[PDB]
Amino acid sequence: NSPQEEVELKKLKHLEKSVEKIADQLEELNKELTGIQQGFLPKDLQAEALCKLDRRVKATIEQFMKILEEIDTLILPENFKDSRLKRKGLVKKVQAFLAECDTVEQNICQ
Amino acid sequence: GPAVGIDLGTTYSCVGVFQHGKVEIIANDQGNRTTPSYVAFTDTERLIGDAAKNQVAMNPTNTVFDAKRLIGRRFDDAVVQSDMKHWPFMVVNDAGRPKVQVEYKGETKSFYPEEVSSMVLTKMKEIAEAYLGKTVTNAVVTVPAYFNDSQRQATKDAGTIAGLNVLRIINEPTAAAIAYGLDKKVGAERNVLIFDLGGGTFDVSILTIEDGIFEVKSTAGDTHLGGEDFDNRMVNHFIAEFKRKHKKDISENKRAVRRLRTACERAKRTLSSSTQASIEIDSLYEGIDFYTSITRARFEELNADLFRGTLDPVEKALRDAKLDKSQIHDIVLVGGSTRIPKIQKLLQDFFNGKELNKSINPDEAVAYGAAVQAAILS
Ligand SMILES: Nc1nccc2ccccc12
């Protein structure tokens, strides 16, 4: 438990915070995806309504990617175990959200 | 306000102001000393610079760049047709002239290359006004030495459309030479070589400076050779390494490749100050954490032919300028890629131990000289 580790752990707390902010946008898109599928819109209008969400899903994908690129700049030595665990869990969370992002893409602009 | 110096680069543009006996390189709204020469068109807005580049993976077909490769050129130009292959956006014919075609606010809209470069210049004018807190109209805009009458007039028109009073259109190698005050240097005529490796292009120029008057003696270099080629060789090395270490091919996972590329781009930069670079990319491909390293020596070997290949246009420039390598008074380094110690060593070894001009940031050297010229013309 070195002080120099708190610098790295704080960086990861800010990165985790930023991930929650992107995760909130993904959840709103999910509420709109389900919102069109179980909504009042006519069949032909639904296809357009679903595809209009394409800019936002690509925006959410890009943001998660920029977060990964930032996590990928961190050099965490072997002793910094708590920081390597936070970095593994955050990368895994972002990648599970990216799989959810891809699921939304599969259900739109078909 | 005062007059500014603008380097209107292919990938990144740069703006400088001469103040308090020194050139100050103006930072943009995102805090960057260079602004990407990018223009994005969307359903709701037109983005310029960093904002345009940040959404390039979201809206590739409607994000324009490399307009400098099209400005003042004919549609049927060999350069135009060969670069069209790599652009996600559309380049269309309009009575022999190229236009960029994009979807903007729901409708199909076309723009001339100088209309796009004028949006990029309006941004650099704004950047300068945001720093100085004063209105900027007067500017010195740089162009490469090989640019013709049409290519120069197109750039001059891009400044006119941007609301600038273009004080002068000057050559990039001349600007870099002004930055090092090679024209103030006492004595007879000075034969100066400019080594420009940066901004996706490579240009070797030979100048003659006699009593403040510059003369272009020769121009050589590869139009499509830069930092991106030195990155590829590192990316290939790592994909081959992951294959040996884990028997997995990451080359088809676009996101994994991008993660490796970004780490490679940074590791390259580190190898200019350090001898070793370290990469740690968790769950790169199929949950596999990629923990690796790359020495400066290794990077140099992977790019050995490419780095050496920078001496071919140096020799071709000397042949064409009818000069011996011993007859060169000054060597100037410009463009981010000149930062590589091997590039500097090979060029210094070739010139039998002559000290290169490398103090001024290679990314900023052309804007530095343009800012001196803007203050001289005022
Ligand atoms: N080291 C290095 N090599 C090429 C381009 C660069 C750009 C900016 C900083 C460092 C660079």
Numbering used by the authors:
A (entry chain D): 151 to 260
B (entry chain C): 4 to 381
Text lifted from the article:
The 70 kDa heat shock proteins (HSP70s) are an abundant family of ATP-dependent molecular chaperones, involved in many cellular processes including protein folding, prevention of protein aggregation, modulation of protein complexes, and protein transport between cellular compartments. HSP70s consist of a conserved N-terminal nucleotide binding domain (NBD) with ATPase activity, a substrate binding domain (SBD), and a poorly conserved C-terminal domain which terminates with an EEVD tetratricopeptide repeat interaction motif123. The two main cytosolic HSP70s are the ubiquitously expressed HSC70 (HSPA8), and the stress-induced HSP72 (HSPA1A)3.
Critical to this binding mode is the interaction of the aminoquinazoline N1 atom with the Ser275 hydroxyl group, as was confirmed by the 1-aminoisoquinoline fragment 22 in which the N1 atom has been replaced by a methine group. This change resulted in a loss of binding affinity measured by SPR, but surprisingly a crystal structure of 22 bound to HSC70-NBD/BAG1 could still be obtained.
